[PDB]
Amino acid sequence: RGVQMLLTTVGAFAAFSLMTIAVGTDYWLYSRGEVMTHSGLWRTCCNFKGLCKQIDHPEDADYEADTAEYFLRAVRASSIFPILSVILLFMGGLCIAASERHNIILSAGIFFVSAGLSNIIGIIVYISANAGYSYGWSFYFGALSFIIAEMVGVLAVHMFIDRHKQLRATARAT
């Protein structure tokens, strides 16, 4: 399983890299004169160092549409992170549970769909940032990374279907 052992390596190390990316808070410096080292949770400023959380998107028990869309820009971060983390939870899930039948394959599917919602998260994020030019590389990291892990352990999943199902079926062609 040298190819596929390496696939696992890419899987887990991919995952750790993923969440390190998520922390990558450097999403830009936006220098206003300040300069703004602006994380996911808060946005931090710079000369004199300053920081601030989300200003608004963030309150007012209002209803209907565009208001609820402000509520969205609040929620949109909470669309971003959890899906990614869950994908990871999978990733380890078939890191160890590779050995032992279906859940392997079943899981792995659920793994990489969870992995899939990530770029969605991103787009969400950027257009939140399109509430109102520089950027940060953490984005790019994440975006590519999901693609990677996804491809890798999915192609694995194929190898499960093939080996298990077809190859062992043929093993039963006796």
Return the biggest CA–CA distance within the chain.
78
Q: Is 162 near another protein (CB under 8 A)? A: yes
What does the block give as tokens for 37? 């080292």
Q: Is 136 near another protein (CB under 8 A)? A: no
CB of 154 to another protein, least distance (A): 7
Q: Measured between alpha carbons, how far is 111 from 152 in angstroms, rounded to an integer?
A: 12
Which residues are within 8 A (CB) of 150 and not within 5 positions of it... i.e. 6 or more apart? 112, 115, 116
Q: Measured between alpha carbons, how far is 37 from 60 in angstroms, rounded to an integer?
A: 28
Q: Among all chains, which residue has been given the structure tokens 């093939």?
A: 162
Q: Is 151 near another protein (CB under 8 A)? A: yes
Q: Is 150 near another protein (CB under 8 A)? A: yes
Q: What is the DSSP string of 122-157?
A: HHHHHHHGGG-----HHHHHHHHHHHHHHHHHHHHH
**Among 2-10, 21-29, 48-56, 161-169, which window interacts with another protein (CB under 8 A)?**
161-169
Q: Is 74 near another protein (CB under 8 A)? A: no
Helix (H) or strand (E) segment spanning residue 42: strand 42-45
What does the block give as tokens for 33? 């004169």
77 versus 113: smaller Cβ distance to another protein: 113
19 versus 123: smaller Cβ distance to another protein: 123
| Range 96-135, binding another protein (CB under 8 A) | 106, 109, 113, 116-117, 119-120, 122-124, 126-127, 130
Q: Is 170 near another protein (CB under 8 A)? A: no
99 versus 130: smaller Cβ distance to another protein: 130
Q: Is 137 near another protein (CB under 8 A)? A: no
Question: Which residues of this chain interact with another protein, rule CB under 8 A?
Answer: 106, 109, 113, 116-117, 119-120, 122-124, 126-127, 130, 143, 147, 150-151, 154, 158, 161-162, 165-166
